[PDB]
Design a protein around this nucleic acid. Structure first.
Ligand SMILES: [Mg+2]
Ligand SMILES: [Mg+2]
Ligand SMILES: [Mg+2]
Ligand SMILES: [Mg+2]
Lengths: 59, 148, 114, 210
RNA sequence: CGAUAGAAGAAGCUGUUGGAAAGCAGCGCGCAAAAGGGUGAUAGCCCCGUAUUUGAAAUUGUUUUCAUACCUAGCGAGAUCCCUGAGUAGCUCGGAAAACGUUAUUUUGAGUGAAUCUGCCCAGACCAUUGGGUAAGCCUAAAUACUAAUUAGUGACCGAUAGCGAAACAGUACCGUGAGGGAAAGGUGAAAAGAACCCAGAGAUGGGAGUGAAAUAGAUUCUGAAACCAUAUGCCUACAACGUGUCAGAGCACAUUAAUGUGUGAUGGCGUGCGUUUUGAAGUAUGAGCCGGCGAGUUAUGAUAGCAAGCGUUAGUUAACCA
RNA sequence: UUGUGGUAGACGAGCGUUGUAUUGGAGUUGAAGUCAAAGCGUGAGCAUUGGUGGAUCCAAUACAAGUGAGAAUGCCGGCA
C-alpha cells in the first residue's frame, strides 16, 4: 500500500494523531482579504475529525 | 495434553459469510446495499475522492521542504530519565556496545539530553550535552567530557 | 478439496415434498410448487388458528340465543342476568352444552329470575 | 522427582534418579501448546493442488451467440464459470502459504510445559545407553522388552542424545514406536507419545535449554 | 564412485459363519522386511516385492591421482628519453536509457572537434582547493531463470457435468472453401461357466431349462433417485364458480416408529402464488415448461480496528540464508 | 421486573457437508448410497425398522475449505 504522494506533502503527522495542515487562501490575492484574516490564516491548524478517517488511511 | 481433545480459550469469531442465504443474514444483497455503484463489482472509488468536488488534499497548500534532497542526520540519544535505570559508570561507545543499546557496527555520534535528576555520579563521553542536562550531571558530582 | 453434496439437497427437498401430500396435481410432485403450497398452507394455519376461536364463540352465542328465544327472553338480556345479579362465571360454551342435556339448563334460565 | 532407570529385562533398577526443579514448572501454558500443535500440523502440507480459471482453459474467445435478436441468454463465452466446459472461478491455487508463526519464547514455554506434564506421568521411564546395546539389530528382543515392560499398545517414543544405531535398526519396522535425537522432538511429537523413554544424559542438556 | 538389463531375499496352521475367509476366534512364528499390488471378502507369515547384501562383457557420466605440453614469478639503481587505444571525450540541434515527464551521469541521427602524467575524467548546472579513478580494445566459470523430456516418489489435488479439450483409436467424428472452431460417452462376474436343449414365433426375442452364491447379475450388463408414462386394492367426484389449501366435519375402508392414530374427504367458515425491482405489484410489469447436476465475496503481499496469547520496562522481534 | 412485528443493515450463538490428525468403535450374522413408514427436536437438521445393494464407515475434540441453491430470457442431460 503506497502512500498517496500528493498527500504526504500536505499533512505532516504529529504525536498522538492530530494530523497537521496549513491553511488555504494564502497564495494568491492579498488585498481582497483583510489583515485579521491573513494573520489568522498564517497559523497552521488541525484537520476536522470528519476528514480524519479519510486521511489517516490515506497515509 | 490429549490431542484427542485439544481446545483453546477464545479465538473463533463470527465469520460473516456474505452470500449463503438470508437466515444467517448478509444474503442476496450481501451487505452491498441496493443497486448503487458500490453494489456492483469493484465499487469503492479511489481512496481520497469526493466525487468531482476538489478533494481536501487538492484544496490545501503544500508544505515546503527546505533542505531539499537531503536526509536529516540521525543522532543516537541518551535521555537521563531512563539512563538511571541502566546501571553503568563511565558511559561511552565501548560500553554501550556491551549494554546492547548501541551496536558495534554503528559509527554514529552520541547526544545527551534530559532534565531529570540522577543520584549517583556517571562519567559521560559524548558529543553534545544540553545546558541543564550538563548542569544536572555535574550537580551529581560527576563529570562530562565533550568529545570533538 | 472439492465437495459435491447431493445428499443434503435431496433430503431437504424430500422433507418439503413430504410436507405437502394430498395436494392436487403436480403440487406433490415438483418441489418448487410444493414449497410455495406448504408456505401458503402454514400461513392459512396461522390465520385459522385464531379465526376458529373467533368463530366458535360466535357459534356458541348463536346456539345460546336460539335456546333462550324459546323461554321468553333474548341472549342480550341473559348476560346482564348473569353478571349483575347472581354473579356467575359460568362460561359461554357450557351454558350452550347444557341444552344438549336440557332440563338442567332450564334451572339456569329460571334461576336468574330473582 | 522419582525418575527411575529401567533395564532391558523390563525389571526396574533399585536406585531412582532425582531431578532438578527447573525442569518442572509450577506454571503451565495451555495456549502456546495448542498453537504449536497447529503450526506443526500445518507446515506438513504440500499444497500442490491447482485449478484452471476462466482464462487458462483451452477456450473460445469467440462469442457463441450474438448479443440480441436470437432469443437465448447473453452468454459471452463458452468457457465461463457456469458453463460445463468449466472455468472454475476462484478454486484453489498452488501459491497458498499455509504457514503460521510462533514467537520463539512462546515455543520454549510450550515445550517446557509439555515436557513438565509428560515427564511426571508415571510412564517416562529413564533409560541408559546399555540397553540401547544388548539389543542386536534384531527387533524381536525389542518387542520382548516392550512386552515385558507392559508397553505394547502404547506409542512409546525414544529420545537419545548420541543417536545409537542398534536401536534405530530396531523399531523402524515397528509402526508404533520411533527414536529421535533430542533436537528433533516437537510439541506434537512429544504430547503424542503417551509413553516415552528418556536417556539419563539428555537431562543435563534439557535443563540448560529450559 | 555412479547411470543403463538383473541375482539371493525370513516367518502359519486349526475352528465357525461362509459360494470363496485372507476376516472373527485359538495357539504360534519372523523382522535392517508392519512401503505397495494381486490372491473368490479386510493377509506382517499364498504369491510378487520391499529392507538388506550384491553384480557389467559393451557404452556413458563425475571426480581423483601420476606424467605430459602452452601460458604464467621477484626486490633495487639511472632521468626534461619514448609509449600508455582520435572523427575519439567534449560543444551545438533534435530524441531516448536511467527511479527522474530530459538533468548531472549514459547512449546518438546531423555538424563541429582537443589534450598527453605539470595530462584526461569524476564527486546533480558551474569555478577553485582537496580527494578518487585512468575511458575511447578483447575474454570470463560460479551463484541466477526455465523443464515438453528420463528415472524414483509425493499430495488435508480431481475421481467421468470433475480433472488436460482428450480415462476409449481426440484434436478423432463434425462445422467451415480457409485461417480456424471443436464435443459425448467408462464398470457383468472372482472366472464366460456368454446362457447347449424345449415351446411360441419367420426372426430378433421371450418364457422354462442349464452354469453360478444371486440371472430383480444375461450382455439394455455396478448401484439405479426425480421429472415422466402406464396397472391396481381403499375413499371421493357428472347443479358446479374453484392461487386448489386451511380450520371445522359427516359417512366410508383399514390398523400403526401406540399414538387424544391412519387414507380419502359429501358439507360450513376463510382465502387474489414465489423471486426481482418499485412510492406501491395478485398483477393487464417483468424471470423460470418440469426434474437432476454444475454455477457467483476467495487468494498473495501490506494498513487500521476488535478479541485472545507469548514476552516486558534500556523492552519486543526476526527476514533472506545455512543445517 | 421490563420486554420478544420488521426489509436494507450492525451484533451474537449455531446445524450440516468433504478431508487430515490423534482417541474409541461397527461391518458379508451385510457398510455407505436409494426408495417406503402412522417417530424425536425451538430451527438449520437427527435417529429406528424393513425391502434393495454388495464394501466400506459412525460418534467425540481440534484443524482446513472448490462448504450449503428455486430464480441469472443461466450451462449440460432427460422428460412432458
Ligand atoms: Mg439486484
Ligand atoms: Mg560537486
Ligand atoms: Mg432467495
Ligand atoms: Mg412481456
Amino acid at each position: 500500500m503506497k502512500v498517496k504522494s500528493a498527500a504526504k506533502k500536505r499533512f505532516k503527522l504529529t504525536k498522538s494523531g492530530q494530523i497537521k495542515r496549513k491553511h488555504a487562501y494564502t497564495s494568491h490575492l492579498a488585498p481582497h482579504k483583510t489583515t485579521k484574516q491573513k494573520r489568522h490564516l498564517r497559523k497552521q491548524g488541525t484537520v476536522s475529525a470528519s476528514d480524519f478517517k479519510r486521511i489517516g488511511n490515506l497515509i | 495434553l490429549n490431542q484427542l481433545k485439544s481446545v483453546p480459550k477464545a479465538r473463533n469469531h463470527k465469520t460473516k459469510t456474505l452470500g449463503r442465504g438470508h437466515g444467517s443474514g448478509l444474503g442476496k444483497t450481501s451487505g452491498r446495499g441496493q443497486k448503487g455503484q458500490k453494489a456492483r463489482k469493484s465499487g469503492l472509488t479511489r481512496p481520497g475522492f469526493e466525487g468531482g468536488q476538489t478533494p481536501l488534499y487538492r484544496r490545501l497548500p503544500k508544505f515546503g521542504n527546505a533542505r531539499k534532497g537531503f536526509l536529516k542526520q540521525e543522532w543516537v540519544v541518551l535521555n537521563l530519565n531512563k539512563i538511571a535505570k541502566l546501571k553503568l559508570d563511565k558511559i561511552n561507545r565501548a560500553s554501550l556496545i556491551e549494554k546492547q543499546v548501541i551496536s558495534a557496527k554503528s559509527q554514529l555520534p552520541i547526544k545527551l539530553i534530559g532534565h531529570t535528576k540522577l543520584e549517583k555520579p556517571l562519567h559521560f563521553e559524548v558529543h553534545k550535552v544540553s545546558k541543564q542536562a550538563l548542569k544536572a550531571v555535574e550537580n551529581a558530582n560527576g563529570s562530562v567530557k565533550l568529545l570533538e | 478439496m472439492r465437495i459435491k453434496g447431493g445428499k443434503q439437497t435431496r433430503v431437504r427437498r424430500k422433507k418439503w415434498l413430504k410436507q405437502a401430500s394430498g395436494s392436487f396435481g403436480t403440487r406433490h410432485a415438483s418441489y418448487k410448487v410444493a414449497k410455495q403450497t406448504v408456505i401458503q398452507a402454514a400461513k392459512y394455519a396461522y390465520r385459522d388458528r385464531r379465526n376458529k376461536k373467533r368463530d366458535f364463540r360466535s357459534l356458541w352465542i348463536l346456539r345460546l340465543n336460539a335456546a333462550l328465544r324459546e323461554q321468553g327472553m333474548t341472549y342480550s338480556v341473559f348476560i346482564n342476568l348473569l353478571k349483575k345479579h347472581n354473579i356467575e362465571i359460568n362460561r359461554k360454551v357450557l351454558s350452550e352444552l347444557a341444552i344438549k342435556e336440557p332440563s338442567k339448563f332450564n334451572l339456569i334460565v329460571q334461576k336468574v329470575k330473582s | 522427582a522419582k525418575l527411575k532407570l529401567i533395564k532391558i529385562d523390563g525389571s526396574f533398577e533399585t536406585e531412582p534418579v532425582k531431578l532438578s526443579p527447573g525442569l518442572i514448572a509450577k506454571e503451565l501454558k495451555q495456549q502456546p501448546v495448542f498453537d504449536a500443535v497447529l503450526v506443526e500440523q500445518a507446515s506438513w502440507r504440500q499444497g500442490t493442488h491447482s485449478i484452471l480459471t476462466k482464462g487458462e482453459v483451452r477456450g473460445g474467445g469467440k462469442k457463441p451467440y450474438k448479443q440480441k435478436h436470437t432469443g437465448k441468454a447473453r452468454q459471452g463465452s463458452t468457457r465461463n464459470p457456469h458453463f460445463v466446459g468449466g472455468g472454475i472461478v476462484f478454486g484453489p491455487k498452488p501459491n497458498r502459504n499455509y504457514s503460521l508463526k510462533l514467537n520463539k519464547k512462546a515455543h520454549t514455554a510450550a515445550l517446557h510445559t509439555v515436557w513438565s506434564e509428560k515427564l511426571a506421568s508415571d510412564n517416562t521411564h529413564l533409560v541408559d545407553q546399555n540397553l540401547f546395546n544388548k539389543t542386536e539389530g534384531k527387533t524381536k528382543v525389542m518387542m520382548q522388552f516392550l512386552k515385558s515392560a507392559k508397553l505394547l499398545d502404547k506409542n512409546v517414543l525414544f529420545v537419545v542424545n548420541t543417536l545409537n544405531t542398534n536401536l534405530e535398526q530396531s523399531t523402524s519396522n515397528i509402526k508404533n514406536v520411533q527414536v529421535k535425537h533430542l533436537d528433533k522432538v516437537s510439541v506434537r511429537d512429544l504430547m503424542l507419545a503417551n509413553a516415552l523413554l528418556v536417556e539419563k544424559e539428555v537431562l543435563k542438556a534439557l535443563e540448560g535449554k529450559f
